[PDB]
Design a protein around this ligand. Structure first.
Ligand code: HEM
Length: 154
């Protein structure tokens, strides 16, 4: 699968808005993930104990991790599919150390789409959401291929 330049531009134009406040977007996205799919919270040993959205919002560590995730994802998106180098360490750590199944990457992709849809109707209309879905699907497809190479089913 291959995105068009027009599709990448739709992806990068909403990402420019995320970057006005990556910390805030990261909090919203992780909270959405943890609330919609509470099982995902178990993979974070710093966070598996968090009981409420208020606790999640107050966690400086969660905020930091949200910035780390979205900044790594942003760097991937800006490669416009040419992300082999970026995917290598990410696939290795997530397959082998953190043990994050592909299904959970699907869950966080859902959270990203949901938050962007809510925050950015000006840059996340139907065409832009389609483009972002395509970009995240490409990311997951390529990560899943790497998981397999690394010896993890995902
Ligand atoms: C867009 C998808 C994601 C991206 C771009 C991303 C990125 C990152 C990065 C850059 C790190 C730090 C370096 C590393 O260990 O590789 C990290 C760590 C980590 N990630 Fe992910 N991540 C994603 C999804 C997830 C999901 C869905 C989970 C769990 C449900 C998860 C769990 C973790 C954990 C437990 C760590 C280690 C945290 C720590 O040591 O404090 N990640 N991630």
């Amino acid at each position: 699968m291959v995105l068009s330049e027009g599709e990448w531009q739709l992806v990068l134009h909403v990402w420019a808005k995320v970057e006005a406040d990556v910390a805030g977007h990261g909090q919203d996205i992780l909270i959405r993930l943890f609330k919609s799919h509470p099982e995902t919270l178990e993979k974070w040993d710093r966070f598996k104990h968090l009981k409420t959205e208020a606790e999640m919002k107050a966690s400086e560590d969660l905020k930091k991790d949200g910035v780390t995730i979205l900044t790594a994802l942003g760097a991937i998106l800006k490669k416009k599919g040419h992300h082999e180098a970026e995917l290598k360490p990410l696939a290795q750590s997530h397959a082998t150390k953190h043990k994050i199944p592909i299904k959970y990457l699907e869950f966080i992709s859902e959270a990203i789409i949901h938050v962007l849809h809510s925050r950015h109707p000006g840059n996340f209309g139907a065409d832009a959401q389609g483009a972002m879905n395509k970009a995240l699907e490409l990311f997951r497809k390529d990560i899943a291929a790497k998981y397999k190479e690394l010896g993890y089913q995902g």
